[PDB]
Write a protein that binds this ligand. Structure first.
Ligand SMILES: [K+]
Ligand SMILES: [K+]
Ligand SMILES: [K+]
Ligand SMILES: [K+]
Ligand SMILES: [K+]
Ligand SMILES: [K+]
Ligand SMILES: [K+]
Ligand SMILES: [K+]
Ligand SMILES: [K+]
Ligand SMILES: [K+]
Ligand SMILES: [K+]
Ligand SMILES: [K+]
Ligand SMILES: [K+]
Ligand SMILES: [K+]
Ligand SMILES: [K+]
Ligand SMILES: [K+]
Ligand SMILES: [Mg+2]
Ligand SMILES: [Mg+2]
Ligand SMILES: [Mg+2]
Ligand SMILES: [Mg+2]
Ligand SMILES: [Mg+2]
Ligand SMILES: [Mg+2]
Ligand SMILES: [Mg+2]
Ligand SMILES: [Mg+2]
Ligand SMILES: [Mg+2]
Ligand SMILES: [Mg+2]
Ligand SMILES: [Mg+2]
Ligand SMILES: [Mg+2]
Ligand SMILES: [Mg+2]
Ligand SMILES: [Mg+2]
Ligand SMILES: [Mg+2]
Ligand SMILES: [Mg+2]
Ligand SMILES: [Mg+2]
Ligand SMILES: [Mg+2]
Ligand SMILES: [Mg+2]
Ligand SMILES: [Mg+2]
Ligand SMILES: [Mg+2]
Ligand SMILES: [Mg+2]
Ligand SMILES: [Mg+2]
Ligand SMILES: [Mg+2]
Ligand SMILES: [Mg+2]
Ligand SMILES: [Mg+2]
Ligand SMILES: [Mg+2]
Ligand SMILES: [Mg+2]
Ligand SMILES: [Mg+2]
Ligand SMILES: [Mg+2]
Ligand SMILES: [Mg+2]
Ligand SMILES: [Mg+2]
Ligand SMILES: [Mg+2]
Ligand SMILES: [Mg+2]
Ligand SMILES: [Mg+2]
Ligand SMILES: [Mg+2]
Ligand SMILES: [Mg+2]
Ligand SMILES: [Mg+2]
Ligand SMILES: [Mg+2]
Ligand SMILES: [Mg+2]
Ligand SMILES: [Mg+2]
Ligand SMILES: [Mg+2]
Ligand SMILES: [Mg+2]
Ligand SMILES: [Mg+2]
Ligand SMILES: [Mg+2]
Ligand SMILES: [Mg+2]
Ligand SMILES: [Mg+2]
Ligand SMILES: [Mg+2]
Ligand SMILES: [Mg+2]
Ligand SMILES: [Mg+2]
Ligand SMILES: [Mg+2]
Ligand SMILES: [Mg+2]
Ligand SMILES: [Mg+2]
Ligand SMILES: [Mg+2]
Ligand SMILES: [Mg+2]
Ligand SMILES: [Mg+2]
Ligand SMILES: [Mg+2]
Ligand SMILES: [Mg+2]
Ligand SMILES: [Mg+2]
Ligand SMILES: [Mg+2]
Ligand SMILES: [Mg+2]
Ligand SMILES: [Mg+2]
Ligand SMILES: [Mg+2]
Ligand SMILES: [Mg+2]
Ligand SMILES: [Mg+2]
Ligand SMILES: [Mg+2]
Ligand SMILES: [Mg+2]
Ligand SMILES: [Mg+2]
Ligand SMILES: [Mg+2]
Ligand SMILES: [Mg+2]
Ligand SMILES: [Mg+2]
Ligand SMILES: [Mg+2]
Ligand SMILES: [Mg+2]
Ligand SMILES: [Mg+2]
Ligand SMILES: [Mg+2]
Ligand SMILES: [Mg+2]
Ligand SMILES: [Mg+2]
Ligand SMILES: [Mg+2]
Ligand SMILES: [Mg+2]
Ligand SMILES: [Mg+2]
Ligand SMILES: [Mg+2]
Ligand SMILES: [Mg+2]
Ligand SMILES: [Mg+2]
Ligand SMILES: [Mg+2]
Ligand SMILES: [Mg+2]
Ligand SMILES: [Mg+2]
Ligand SMILES: [Mg+2]
Ligand SMILES: [Mg+2]
Ligand SMILES: [Mg+2]
Ligand SMILES: [Mg+2]
Ligand SMILES: [Mg+2]
Ligand SMILES: [Mg+2]
Ligand SMILES: [Mg+2]
Ligand SMILES: [Mg+2]
Ligand SMILES: [Mg+2]
Ligand SMILES: [Mg+2]
Ligand SMILES: [Mg+2]
Ligand SMILES: [Mg+2]
Ligand SMILES: [Mg+2]
Ligand SMILES: [Mg+2]
Ligand SMILES: [Mg+2]
Ligand SMILES: [Mg+2]
Ligand SMILES: [Mg+2]
Ligand SMILES: [Mg+2]
Ligand SMILES: [Mg+2]
Ligand SMILES: [Mg+2]
Ligand SMILES: [Mg+2]
Ligand SMILES: [Mg+2]
Ligand SMILES: [Mg+2]
Ligand SMILES: [Mg+2]
Ligand SMILES: [Mg+2]
Ligand SMILES: [Mg+2]
Ligand SMILES: [Mg+2]
Ligand SMILES: [Mg+2]
Ligand SMILES: [Mg+2]
Ligand SMILES: [Mg+2]
Ligand SMILES: [Mg+2]
Ligand SMILES: [Mg+2]
Ligand SMILES: [Mg+2]
Ligand SMILES: [Mg+2]
Ligand SMILES: [Mg+2]
Ligand SMILES: [Mg+2]
Ligand SMILES: [Mg+2]
Ligand SMILES: [Mg+2]
Ligand SMILES: [Mg+2]
Ligand SMILES: [Mg+2]
Ligand SMILES: [Mg+2]
Ligand SMILES: [Mg+2]
Ligand SMILES: [Mg+2]
Ligand SMILES: [Mg+2]
Ligand SMILES: [Mg+2]
Ligand SMILES: [Mg+2]
Ligand SMILES: [Mg+2]
Ligand SMILES: [Mg+2]
Ligand SMILES: [Mg+2]
Ligand SMILES: [Mg+2]
Ligand SMILES: [Mg+2]
Ligand SMILES: [Mg+2]
Ligand SMILES: [Mg+2]
Ligand SMILES: [Mg+2]
Ligand SMILES: [Mg+2]
Ligand SMILES: [Mg+2]
Ligand SMILES: [Mg+2]
Ligand SMILES: [Mg+2]
Ligand SMILES: [Mg+2]
Ligand SMILES: [Mg+2]
Ligand SMILES: [Mg+2]
Ligand SMILES: [Mg+2]
Ligand SMILES: [Mg+2]
Ligand SMILES: [Mg+2]
Ligand SMILES: [Mg+2]
Ligand SMILES: [Mg+2]
Ligand SMILES: [Mg+2]
Ligand SMILES: [Mg+2]
Ligand SMILES: [Mg+2]
Ligand SMILES: [Mg+2]
Ligand SMILES: [Mg+2]
Ligand SMILES: [Mg+2]
Ligand SMILES: [Mg+2]
Ligand SMILES: [Mg+2]
Ligand SMILES: [Mg+2]
Ligand SMILES: [Mg+2]
Ligand SMILES: [Mg+2]
Ligand SMILES: [Mg+2]
Ligand SMILES: [Mg+2]
Ligand SMILES: [Mg+2]
Ligand SMILES: [Mg+2]
Ligand SMILES: [Mg+2]
Ligand SMILES: [Mg+2]
Ligand SMILES: [Mg+2]
Ligand SMILES: [Mg+2]
Ligand SMILES: [Mg+2]
Ligand SMILES: [Mg+2]
Ligand SMILES: [Mg+2]
Ligand SMILES: [Mg+2]
Ligand SMILES: [Mg+2]
Ligand SMILES: [Mg+2]
Ligand SMILES: [Mg+2]
Ligand SMILES: [Mg+2]
Ligand SMILES: [Mg+2]
Ligand SMILES: [Mg+2]
Ligand SMILES: [Mg+2]
Ligand SMILES: [Mg+2]
Ligand SMILES: [Mg+2]
Ligand SMILES: [Mg+2]
Ligand SMILES: [Mg+2]
Ligand SMILES: [Mg+2]
Ligand SMILES: [Mg+2]
Ligand SMILES: [Mg+2]
Ligand SMILES: [Mg+2]
Ligand SMILES: [Mg+2]
Ligand SMILES: [Mg+2]
Ligand SMILES: [Mg+2]
Ligand SMILES: [Mg+2]
Ligand SMILES: [Mg+2]
Ligand SMILES: [Mg+2]
Ligand SMILES: [Mg+2]
Ligand SMILES: [Mg+2]
Ligand SMILES: [Mg+2]
Ligand SMILES: [Mg+2]
Ligand SMILES: [Mg+2]
Ligand SMILES: [Mg+2]
Ligand SMILES: [Mg+2]
Ligand SMILES: [Mg+2]
Ligand SMILES: [Mg+2]
Ligand SMILES: [Mg+2]
Ligand SMILES: [Mg+2]
Ligand SMILES: [Mg+2]
Ligand SMILES: [Mg+2]
Ligand SMILES: [Mg+2]
Ligand SMILES: [Mg+2]
Ligand SMILES: [Mg+2]
Ligand SMILES: [Mg+2]
Ligand SMILES: [Mg+2]
Ligand SMILES: [Mg+2]
Ligand SMILES: [Mg+2]
Ligand SMILES: [Mg+2]
Ligand SMILES: [Mg+2]
Ligand SMILES: [Mg+2]
Ligand SMILES: [Mg+2]
Ligand SMILES: [Mg+2]
Ligand SMILES: [Mg+2]
Ligand SMILES: [Mg+2]
Ligand SMILES: [Mg+2]
Ligand SMILES: [Mg+2]
Ligand SMILES: [Mg+2]
Ligand SMILES: [Mg+2]
Ligand SMILES: [Mg+2]
Ligand SMILES: [Mg+2]
Ligand SMILES: [Mg+2]
Lengths: 153, 141, 77, 110
RNA sequence: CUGACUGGGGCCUGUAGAGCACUGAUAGGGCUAGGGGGCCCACCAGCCUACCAAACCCUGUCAAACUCCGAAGGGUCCCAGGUGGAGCCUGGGAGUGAGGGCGCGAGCGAUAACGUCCGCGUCCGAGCGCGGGAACAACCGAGACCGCCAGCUAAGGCCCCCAAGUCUGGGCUAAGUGGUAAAGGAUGUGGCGCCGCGAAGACAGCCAUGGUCGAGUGGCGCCGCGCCGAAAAUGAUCGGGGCUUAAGCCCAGCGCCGAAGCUGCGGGUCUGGG
RNA sequence: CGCCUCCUAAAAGGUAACGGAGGCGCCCAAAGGUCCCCUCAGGCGGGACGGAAAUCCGCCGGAGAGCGCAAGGGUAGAAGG
RNA sequence: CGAUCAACGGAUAAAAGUUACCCCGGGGAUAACAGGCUGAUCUCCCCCGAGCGUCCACAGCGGCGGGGAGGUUUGGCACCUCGAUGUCGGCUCGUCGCAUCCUGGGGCUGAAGAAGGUCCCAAGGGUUGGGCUGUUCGCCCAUUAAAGCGGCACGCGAGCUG
RNA sequence: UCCCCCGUGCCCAUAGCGGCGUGGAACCACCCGUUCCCAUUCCGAACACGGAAGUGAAACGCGCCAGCGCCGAUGGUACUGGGCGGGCGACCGCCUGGGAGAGUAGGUCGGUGCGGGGGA
């Protein structure tokens, strides 16, 4: 439920792009690998609510709306700003990626393989001196655990 | 006061404060962190001064994460001695801190409590700092 | 301190003395080493201190064999 | 991991290949015995003999002596005289020893 | 013709960085060999711990004497360019064997010293010859054979002292900031943003959430240039006078001044070739 | 104050300080030559006296053992028994 | 074969002290004084606000820590001076700085008044006599509006003292 | 030229650990014995010899599996040779050439030479 505009890049220097308020990046899967860039403020507003969990649809100047997932954000250590973004392009095959957690500490994104059509949004867990393991997750239909069975959350 | 329990070597050479931070650059345990903006040797005394200030300001609640440790020995020659005759004696320990390093985190407190406690802690430190809150970028790492 | 420390030993000038493609005569020292950092290959002998020396005139050749080690050969003309 | 058999095979053969001769390699199964003459520089077999190809049947020590004669007779027609005997994992004794004497009696220099 | 330097090709290496596979160090949590007490009970054991802590699991870090990794470079050989006060060989004659500043990489020191000790380069030494930097061995420009009342430039400059623009266009500063300092503090000022509430009549004023009120307003972020923080000893001062849409700062242009550098003309001398 | 090992030492070699850490002034008649055979430390389970740890058995375990003495390099396809 | 010739490229087969009774040749290649660079030490000023103060962080205070200034102390360094730069205290004679001891002017006060406390402005003028000790310093006596702290080669021996 | 097996190499885990299935006609192994050659710091366990009653159970060979292990881009960054600047300092920017490590996508349950025996 998110959209963002991406523009192809060929040889413009990434430092030149960043001084213009842009964000260099790449998009790939097992079939394609294309260099892109996005507007920095536009990406930041989406990414704060669409983390590595939610799908971002990229609008290309070629008329293709590709549904992607963020796999990697490379930060500028000094300025605490993103310098590169990796976009994983979704397809018909199942994919492993991190879904959010809903509480009502140890982790904030539990990893499960899932199809793109059954991506869940909420994993509610009910909470002295004890601990909560990942083994106590609800595990809604459509996902398989991609972590160790005894992870503490 | 922190210091290593055991050391292979008692004395270390004065290295270099170059480059941005290597590790520990994103909030990982708490909700609000204090981030270094310039390099320095942070002494064990300054670390304890900052920690106690947050403890006092967090009456009852709060959990504090200290993400730096003073492992580097610090050496000083006695007063009124000339140069030479070997390296000086160990007088304390410091943590090498580079820009971008998250030094402290806090959890279990409201936003207002966290900002005031981290602000006071920064006044105990010899470098400029900033207060950050955990975001999507930290979770993406 | 200045009483406990202060000692060292002379430098030993170790290392490879002839590199790949150089022309050598029989007896030429090829490697000075401690242990078998390099192993004696074809037409190469090893002395009692792991020194590698050429057995015939020819051309030095270096070879890496993974888990079997690094070898030095001399290929005759 | 390696067994005593595998360690024995490597230890004997590494010594042989150091000399740079042609190695006479012997394999001894519970039934038969086989011999090859190998040039390690090129990695090819020059001549080979066995009791399986010659259909020799009898006392195994007697059988192995005739395999050595056949390999020796085969070797000299190709201009080979000087070899190194590679016993592999076998003790120089019994059937392996009989093949070596048979090869020596046939005119092989080792 | 072999040289410094350079091009191609092979081989050698463990620094920068990075990482945690080894050796040490190390934060939080989970699980628990063994610890402190404990309901106890010695007939016999489990259990309690918001007190430690082995291994193990998750998350998170550090290292001149750590390395599963690993550059840029550097070294060396071969071939090719390279004819230079280049190179190699033999012999005669030395001097020197107190160095120093600067830049980068380290140690020592207090990440003090116009400090000290090494590595790579440079300049002074021996260029206290020349131009700029107010003045000033080593900062910037540039290697002075001699003469000229010729020309072009370098660093640096073009308001007067003082040669050349009171030159042109856009913007900022009000502090004489420019023309000597930090943490920290502040409705200085200009520029951009993110949000909120706004004739579902808002902020301020006025009567007590309601009327009065009739165009905006309030909360944060960033950037440029300024303000305070700022007290020393003979008389002051940015070199001086003086300077405010500058003669300050930032961006962009055109022109000029400027050396013993380069050119022009004349002359001497060394080496090599006709 | 001579000698050996590591770091400093800037990935060839070399490189200083009253810089940072440690050793040597022996030894072995086999701890030497060669031939042949063999392969560790550790962990888990079982077993009279017998245990944290003696000797015995089974399983996993690639070098974390060993190599007379410091450190480094090397090394089980042995330089170890 | 005889070597702690171990000061380990090993002066002789064979060797310790002292000099304020001292001497010569040299060095500012190298110390003591003063200057200089530096500012660890020293003096002063800020930041933070735990906590004290009947209540109350900031009248007066300021845990643990942090940032500076000054160039009076003790040092570090060894840059001019060793073909000489006289070194403590006193006396005489001053002059300068202000982080101000008094006198003048102010804000705040946990300022009723009087007397104080603290900070700001202010360097014109002033800032006593004596006992002890070579003393600087300090203590003490009697006073006072007050009996300031520093610089000037720790000002001043071709001005004195010793 | 196809397939299976046996022996010996090379590349040096993309070749390995682990799981599952399969092979006895031939080969190989286990196997049957210990008079003989030879042997056990005791033991025919090992090494050795003489054989063919049995079995592919073990070992070995061959297949499928990406759980672990190993390999691993592109892009970006760190660092840096050379050239220039800024900052009181600790340190930091720009140009030109080079360019990791980690992470991601993904790959891998080997490839290949010589000889010998057998079948199609
Ligand atoms: K601070
Ligand atoms: K030439
Ligand atoms: K580690
Ligand atoms: K090269
Ligand atoms: K120099
Ligand atoms: K501003
Ligand atoms: K001439
Ligand atoms: K001597
Ligand atoms: K006397
Ligand atoms: K003086
Ligand atoms: K101050
Ligand atoms: K003197
Ligand atoms: K005075
Ligand atoms: K007052
Ligand atoms: K006055
Ligand atoms: K006194
Ligand atoms: Mg140092
Ligand atoms: Mg350092
Ligand atoms: Mg990390
Ligand atoms: Mg120190
Ligand atoms: Mg020292
Ligand atoms: Mg010291
Ligand atoms: Mg750091
Ligand atoms: Mg030592
Ligand atoms: Mg010693
Ligand atoms: Mg050394
Ligand atoms: Mg040496
Ligand atoms: Mg050495
Ligand atoms: Mg080498
Ligand atoms: Mg030897
Ligand atoms: Mg043999
Ligand atoms: Mg490093
Ligand atoms: Mg690494
Ligand atoms: Mg540590
Ligand atoms: Mg733990
Ligand atoms: Mg690290
Ligand atoms: Mg480091
Ligand atoms: Mg590191
Ligand atoms: Mg090491
Ligand atoms: Mg390292
Ligand atoms: Mg040439
Ligand atoms: Mg010569
Ligand atoms: Mg002469
Ligand atoms: Mg001469
Ligand atoms: Mg002469
Ligand atoms: Mg001479
Ligand atoms: Mg001389
Ligand atoms: Mg000399
Ligand atoms: Mg000398
Ligand atoms: Mg000298
Ligand atoms: Mg000197
Ligand atoms: Mg000198
Ligand atoms: Mg020099
Ligand atoms: Mg020098
Ligand atoms: Mg300079
Ligand atoms: Mg310098
Ligand atoms: Mg320098
Ligand atoms: Mg420098
Ligand atoms: Mg340097
Ligand atoms: Mg060093
Ligand atoms: Mg230095
Ligand atoms: Mg520092
Ligand atoms: Mg210096
Ligand atoms: Mg000077
Ligand atoms: Mg110097
Ligand atoms: Mg050095
Ligand atoms: Mg040097
Ligand atoms: Mg040098
Ligand atoms: Mg230098
Ligand atoms: Mg020079
Ligand atoms: Mg020069
Ligand atoms: Mg020079
Ligand atoms: Mg010059
Ligand atoms: Mg010169
Ligand atoms: Mg000059
Ligand atoms: Mg001069
Ligand atoms: Mg002069
Ligand atoms: Mg001079
Ligand atoms: Mg200039
Ligand atoms: Mg000049
Ligand atoms: Mg000048
Ligand atoms: Mg002037
Ligand atoms: Mg000047
Ligand atoms: Mg000058
Ligand atoms: Mg001058
Ligand atoms: Mg110059
Ligand atoms: Mg000139
Ligand atoms: Mg002329
Ligand atoms: Mg001109
Ligand atoms: Mg010009
Ligand atoms: Mg020029
Ligand atoms: Mg003029
Ligand atoms: Mg004008
Ligand atoms: Mg301004
Ligand atoms: Mg002002
Ligand atoms: Mg000002
Ligand atoms: Mg001014
Ligand atoms: Mg000013
Ligand atoms: Mg200011
Ligand atoms: Mg100011
Ligand atoms: Mg002011
Ligand atoms: Mg002052
Ligand atoms: Mg204008
Ligand atoms: Mg001229
Ligand atoms: Mg000229
Ligand atoms: Mg002429
Ligand atoms: Mg000596
Ligand atoms: Mg010696
Ligand atoms: Mg180097
Ligand atoms: Mg090399
Ligand atoms: Mg080296
Ligand atoms: Mg030297
Ligand atoms: Mg020197
Ligand atoms: Mg000494
Ligand atoms: Mg040293
Ligand atoms: Mg050692
Ligand atoms: Mg010793
Ligand atoms: Mg010795
Ligand atoms: Mg002996
Ligand atoms: Mg030995
Ligand atoms: Mg031996
Ligand atoms: Mg070991
Ligand atoms: Mg020992
Ligand atoms: Mg070793
Ligand atoms: Mg080993
Ligand atoms: Mg083995
Ligand atoms: Mg003698
Ligand atoms: Mg002597
Ligand atoms: Mg001695
Ligand atoms: Mg001796
Ligand atoms: Mg001596
Ligand atoms: Mg000697
Ligand atoms: Mg010597
Ligand atoms: Mg010598
Ligand atoms: Mg003597
Ligand atoms: Mg003598
Ligand atoms: Mg005597
Ligand atoms: Mg004597
Ligand atoms: Mg005497
Ligand atoms: Mg005397
Ligand atoms: Mg006397
Ligand atoms: Mg005396
Ligand atoms: Mg007397
Ligand atoms: Mg007397
Ligand atoms: Mg007398
Ligand atoms: Mg007398
Ligand atoms: Mg005399
Ligand atoms: Mg005298
Ligand atoms: Mg004298
Ligand atoms: Mg004299
Ligand atoms: Mg004299
Ligand atoms: Mg002299
Ligand atoms: Mg001097
Ligand atoms: Mg001198
Ligand atoms: Mg001296
Ligand atoms: Mg002196
Ligand atoms: Mg002195
Ligand atoms: Mg002196
Ligand atoms: Mg002194
Ligand atoms: Mg002095
Ligand atoms: Mg003077
Ligand atoms: Mg100062
Ligand atoms: Mg101080
Ligand atoms: Mg102080
Ligand atoms: Mg305050
Ligand atoms: Mg209270
Ligand atoms: Mg109050
Ligand atoms: Mg400070
Ligand atoms: Mg100040
Ligand atoms: Mg200061
Ligand atoms: Mg002074
Ligand atoms: Mg001084
Ligand atoms: Mg000194
Ligand atoms: Mg000096
Ligand atoms: Mg010096
Ligand atoms: Mg005189
Ligand atoms: Mg004189
Ligand atoms: Mg004098
Ligand atoms: Mg005089
Ligand atoms: Mg005096
Ligand atoms: Mg005096
Ligand atoms: Mg006196
Ligand atoms: Mg006096
Ligand atoms: Mg006086
Ligand atoms: Mg007086
Ligand atoms: Mg008087
Ligand atoms: Mg006086
Ligand atoms: Mg007087
Ligand atoms: Mg007077
Ligand atoms: Mg005064
Ligand atoms: Mg004042
Ligand atoms: Mg007053
Ligand atoms: Mg008053
Ligand atoms: Mg009153
Ligand atoms: Mg006030
Ligand atoms: Mg005031
Ligand atoms: Mg005041
Ligand atoms: Mg005043
Ligand atoms: Mg004044
Ligand atoms: Mg004043
Ligand atoms: Mg009186
Ligand atoms: Mg008095
Ligand atoms: Mg009196
Ligand atoms: Mg008195
Ligand atoms: Mg009296
Ligand atoms: Mg009296
Ligand atoms: Mg008196
Ligand atoms: Mg007195
Ligand atoms: Mg008296
Ligand atoms: Mg007293
Ligand atoms: Mg009185
Ligand atoms: Mg009195
Ligand atoms: Mg009075
Ligand atoms: Mg003064
Ligand atoms: Mg003075
Ligand atoms: Mg004095
Ligand atoms: Mg004085
Ligand atoms: Mg005085
Ligand atoms: Mg005086
Ligand atoms: Mg005086
Ligand atoms: Mg005087
Ligand atoms: Mg005087
Ligand atoms: Mg006098
Ligand atoms: Mg006097
Ligand atoms: Mg005088
Ligand atoms: Mg005089
Ligand atoms: Mg005089
Ligand atoms: Mg007197
Ligand atoms: Mg006197
Ligand atoms: Mg007297
Ligand atoms: Mg007298
Ligand atoms: Mg096979
Ligand atoms: Mg590999
Ligand atoms: Mg019998
Ligand atoms: Mg089986
Ligand atoms: Mg990528
Ligand atoms: Mg990459
Ligand atoms: Mg790349
Ligand atoms: Mg660089
Ligand atoms: Mg670069
Ligand atoms: Mg470098
Ligand atoms: Mg560079
Ligand atoms: Mg590049
Ligand atoms: Mg990389
Ligand atoms: Mg990579
Ligand atoms: Mg695999």
């Amino acid at each position: 439920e998110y959209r963002l505009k991406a523009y192809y890049r060929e040889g413009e220097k990434p430092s030149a792009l960043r001084r213009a308020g842009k964000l260099p990046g790449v998009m790939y899967n097992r079939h394609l690998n294309r260099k892109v860039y996005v507007d920095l403020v536009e990406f930041d507003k989406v990414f704060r609510q669409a983390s590595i969990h939610h799908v971002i649809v990229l609008e290309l100047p070629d008329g293709q709306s590709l549904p992607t997932l963020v796999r990697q954000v490379n930060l500028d250590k000094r300025r605490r700003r993103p310098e590169h973004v990796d976009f994983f392009v979704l397809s018909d095959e199942p994919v492993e990626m991190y879904v959010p957690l809903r509480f009502v500490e140890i982790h904030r994104d539990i990893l499960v393989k899932v199809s793109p059509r059954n991506i869940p949004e909420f994993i509610e867990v009910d909470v002295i001196g004890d601990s909560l393991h990942a083994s106590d997750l609800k595990l809604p239909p459509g996902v398989e655990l991609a972590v160790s069975p005894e992870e503490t959350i | 006061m922190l210091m290593p329990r055991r050391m292979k070597y008692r004395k270390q050479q004065r290295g270099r404060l170059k480059g941005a931070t290597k590790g520990g650059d994103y909030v990982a345990f708490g909700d609000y962190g204090l981030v270094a903006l310039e390099p320095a040797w942070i002494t064990a005394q300054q670390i304890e001064a900052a920690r106690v200030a947050m403890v006092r300001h967090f009456r009852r609640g709060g959990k504090i994460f200290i993400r730096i440790f003073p492992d580097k020995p610090y050496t000083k020659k006695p007063l009124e001695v000339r140069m030479g005759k070997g390296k000086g004696n160990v007088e304390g320990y410091v943590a090498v801190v580079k820009p971008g390093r998250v030094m402290f985190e806090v959890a279990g407190v409201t936003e207002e409590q966290a900002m005031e406690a981290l602000r006071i802690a920064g006044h105990k430190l010899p470098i400029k700092t900033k207060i950050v809150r955990r975001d999507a970028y930290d979770e993406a790492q | 301190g200045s009483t406990r420390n202060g000692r060292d030993s002379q430098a030993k000038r170790l290392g490879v003395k002839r590199y790949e493609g150089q022309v050598v005569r029989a007896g030429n020292i090829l490697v000075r080493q401690r242990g078998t950092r390099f192993k004696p290959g074809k037409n190469v002998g090893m002395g009692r201190d792991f020194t590698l020396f050429a057995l015939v005139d020819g051309v030095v050749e270096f070879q890496d064999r993974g888990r079997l080690g690094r070898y030095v050969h001399v290929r005759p003309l | 991991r390696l067994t005593a058999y595998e360690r024995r095979k490597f230890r004997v053969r590494n010594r042989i290949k150091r000399t740079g001769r042609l190695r006479l390699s012997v394999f001894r199964s519970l039934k038969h015995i086989y011999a090859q003459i190998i040039d390690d520089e090129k990695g090819v077999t020059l001549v080979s003999a066995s009791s399986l190809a010659l259909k020799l049947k009898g006392n195994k020590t007697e059988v192995a002596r005739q395999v050595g004669r056949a390999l020796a007779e085969k070797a000299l027609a190709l201009g080979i005289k000087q070899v190194a005997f590679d016993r592999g994992p076998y003790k120089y004794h019994g059937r392996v020893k009989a093949l070596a004497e048979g090869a020596r009696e046939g005119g092989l220099e080792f």
